Amino acid sequence: YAWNRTRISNCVADYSVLYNFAPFFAFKCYGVSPTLCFTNVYADS
Amino acid sequence: SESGVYSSANNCTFEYVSQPFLMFKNLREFVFKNIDGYFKI
């Protein structure tokens, strides 16, 4: 679970930087692929 | 001259620091209210 960082804390979440981070082969969203206020992020890896 | 020791804390969800920076005597009045989840001072 690589630490389950709770990303949300409080802050502006800019998701477009993720395309700049690395080339990807998968990005499967069950919500909205072009990305809202969600209160919690609960990121893990 | 010195006091205050905290025993412990965990499961922290929020931190905010020094909104006005400031925080021959003065009366210091405060109003604390909790409306729809927002705590106002």
- Of A33, A43, A36, the closest CA to residue A1 belongs to A43
Q: Is the dihedral of CA A8, A13, B41, B1 positive or negative?
A: positive
Measured CA to CA, the distance from residue A10 to residue B11 in angstroms comes to 15
This structure's resolution (Å) is 3.0
Residue B34 parent element (H or E) = strand B33-35
Report which of A1, A5, A2 is spatially closest to residue A43, judged by C-alpha positions: A5
Pair B23, B30: CB distance under 8 Å: no
Cα B31 to Cα A7, B17, B23, B37, distances in angstroms:
32, 19, 16, 16
